[PDB]
């Protein structure tokens, strides 16, 4: 939520992301939020994943966040398990 | 030239009925007496076009954009190659 954008930095970040993630079994670790370059890492993820030979998910992007800092916590709590886990953005 | 006149010919010769001349009376009773009640024949036009939905439209268009980026970077790679860029370099 405190970020700014310029073109060639975005290009460098995206190119590095796909080149490092598409080869080998690289695991990219990042938080949980859709803000700034933090959102742009994911948008690059789907920019690569939309056109993929194996299709489905060729990348394992793990998000880390604090339960305290979650907007729609109501509905994310279950006693044992239901697993629709709906989270509208 | 072969393929071009083939497609030009088929574009208007493809809209011909599948009923053989021996069995043309059925198509006659279906369409030629149907003509007179209308000023202009409004039969369904025989083409290979398809109606596109919004979701498939966007899902495709993003994909052509991504492969266009892939083509543009490759294009730059070839514009490095010819010796003209070498001589002005």
Swiss-Prot record, chain A:
Superkingdom classification of source: Eukaryota
Annotated ADP-D-ribose 1 binding sites: 2
Subcellular location: Cell membrane; Perikaryon; Cell projection; Cytoplasmic vesicle
Tissue expression as described in the entry: Highly expressed in brain and peripheral blood cells, such as neutrophils. Also detected in bone marrow, spleen, heart, liver and lung. Isoform 2 is found in neutrophil granulocytes.
Note on domains (UniProt): Contains two binding sites for ADP-ribose, one in the N-terminal part of the channel and the other in the C-terminal nudix hydrolase domain. Both sites seem to have a role in channel opening, but the interaction of ADP-ribose with the N-terminal site is absolutely required for channel activation.
Quaternary data: Homotetramer. Isoform 1 can interact with isoform 3. This interaction decreases Ca(2+) influx through isoform 1 and suppresses susceptibility to oxidative stress-induced cell death.
Sequence similarity: Belongs to the transient receptor (TC 1.A.4) family. LTrpC subfamily. TRPM2 sub-subfamily.
Protein name: Transient receptor potential cation channel subfamily M member 2
Organism: Homo sapiens
